[model samples]
Target: WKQGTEAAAVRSGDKVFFAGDSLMQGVAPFVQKSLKQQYGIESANLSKQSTGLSYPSFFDWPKTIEETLKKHPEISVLAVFLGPNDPWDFPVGKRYLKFASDEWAQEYLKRVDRILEAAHTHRVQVVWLGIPYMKKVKLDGQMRYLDKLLSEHLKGKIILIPTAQTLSGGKGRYTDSVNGKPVRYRSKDGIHFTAEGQKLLAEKIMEKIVFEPSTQPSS
Candidate 1:
């Protein structure tokens, strides 16, 4: 759960890889369009609907990465945003643990760690998108812990994109708008993002790429 990485680096024009489940599947293309439209950069979207670390047997994310990278080894940056459908139980070794339990949390951490570890091993600069804003009280509460866990573990290690602020784009609970500008960030489902919303998120990702120094802490 602890390590160091070298300051080894990237910026404009570097091939970016976006991966996750449906949420990511939606956002990745927007990001691809944004980066390409803005800087003429090349990027790949590896996001698949319903895929997650929660159920590896059904759709193994690590395996996906291993295979995808072989074809596009130019991918030096990895952006992942998922977890909307991860409230179910997870099997740890030979046993199953209920979602959000201590054991579940530990195992979840390992899955996340494995993803990060894989990225680091390949020297791909990682930017993990934190949970987005929400309207449902119960759902929002459930994700807060996940958001916190993501930020706490990956913040210092990788570039953590705090999406909560961007999704809300203003203060308060959320209304699918940015500030008072009325840029639809959420879709009709109350979960996914609208084109405008995904674009806004892409812009922030671009900002990090253009301005912030890449983190490649040596392990």
Candidate 2:
């Protein structure tokens, strides 16, 4: 109760906290810049590469998120985009957990719940971007599997943004030309988004985020 009160009192103007993997790293700068210019709010982008919920020994996401919120009370919102590096099997103590197994799902959900629980305790709202359609056949299936699990488990816990239909249209096909906009959406590797695609994603995120008008008077 005391910690919660401290966090509540320390919050100032709107601040969005970005957390996730490389996918988030690619888009965080655009979102940060747009939020600053348009809403005059600050943001923190702590996204790293090759990180996911599967590896706690290497990078403990739940602990990191909780500590970040505790340390930075100004941040009231969390924007997350991950799962590209989370489809593989990982070790848990002495036991090896296989991907797509019942055991794996159970453990993964626990990690996810920890993050959500932390956000709830800190009163920080979360906005999570789903994995988009991939170009590779095998990897696409794996990504879709992870996406489904996230969609089911994350319902009502956070604002889940559907990226497949956003970048791929109703057909749900992976392509660079989204909505005939003439911009290259996907990168050459087909996993990450192009520069323009990152801009479009930032625009999508900005649309979902709701913030009170700045109190500072304009000249």
Candidate 3:
């Protein structure tokens, strides 16, 4: 975010829409409430648990967001916590892609483009929230790969909220501690966050959304 980000985004009286799958659902409440308490902004949690970018046939997010924008035209800012439920084999017309395959990246980018196109056409400020580390090695790897793709592809189109660093206390790797206490910031499962971790992420999210670096030190 930059000095002009907040000036160009939804204001206190404007509305925001939060959308994602299960990972997002876990922190959506804290994020929604914090935005309300801090900025007095209105928001809706449109996240659908267990859905993701891997399979739109199961839950078409692009279609869903299009319909949502029509219903709530007041929503000028959009937040997404999607990616954790993906990294599986997804079909593309006649062929299917293996997880993390070269072809998979190409196919996934198409779907991501669709979502970005929809949000941009509606003139909404879009932000992509990353998922934290998971206990399962395979699952964690998948999430990391997806995060990389999102960061690289959606770089200019949307703001990338770096929850991974905030939750892990500046380390991109996983840690179960926040302020010197193990198992305090992250839960045992390692996928979802503890209450303390969510609070940290909420503060970071708002900071990026509402930052005005020109008035203060950029650092």
Candidate 4:
């Protein structure tokens, strides 16, 4: 299988799809701009806020899939990012609940499998962006496990970008504080990103999306 390519050539009339949670909503435009600038490719966003692979809220994804196929049946690539709003027991009577234990990892993987299967059914190449770091959550272990599972389960079927490790700075070099202290990459709220922080994350993503892995392997 071809691991990477510089320019993704779409058939006569095709569209690139962006699907994910609010993070995708925030970063899709930046990615679109980067793609246009780098590859001269036009893309569209089909994301929803606060939605994940585990749940079916806001919009029924099956219906959305049908609608998208009707409009643009030739979707070349699909970028998906979810898991920020994913907790242990979500959708508690139309509200979210607190996450429980590591066992939730299995459920999360199952959900991701469903997502990949659905995308494959639509003949769309999938890119799975993992969850980044947060200030409040101690997700090092959980996310590590999730990364391993995602890599092992969805190897060739989907492209997995390990965002957590990319943002973690392996040896913990980039401190979040000016006092030379160790802090999380995200803000205090544990959800959003600061301007500098967001730029850094965006740079990593743009590196991957814009340039082919064969052309730039480490980006």
Give all TM-scores, in the order shown.
Answer: 0.84, 0.89, 0.86, 0.68
Q: Give the Cα RMSD of candidate 2.
A: 4.9
lDDT of 1 by residue, 1-219 (tens): 232222223555478888888778766777687767776678878788888888988888877877767677677777888877776787868999997888898888888887777777777777778887677877877778777877777767878777887687557465666644556789887788887877777777766665223453334
Q: What's the CA error at residue 189 for candidate 1, in Å? A: 1.5
Compose the digit string of candidate 3's lDDT tens values, residues 20-71: 8866776778878876787787889978978987888889888888889888
Question: Model-by-model lDDT, in order?
Answer: 0.74, 0.82, 0.76, 0.60
* Candidate 2: worst-modelled 10 consecutive residues by lDDT: 1-10
- Candidate 3 backbone overlaps, count: 0
Maximum-lDDT candidate: 2
How many residue pairs clash in all the candidates, one count each?
Answer: 8, 0, 0, 1
How far residue 47's Cα lies from its native spot in candidate 2, in Å, is: 0.4
Winner of 1 and 2 under lDDT:
2
**In candidate 2, what are the lDDT values of residues 165-193, reduced to their tens digit?**
77875567788675534667889898999
Residue 168 CA error for candidate 2 (Å)?
1.2
Backbone clash pairs for candidate 4 read: 88-99
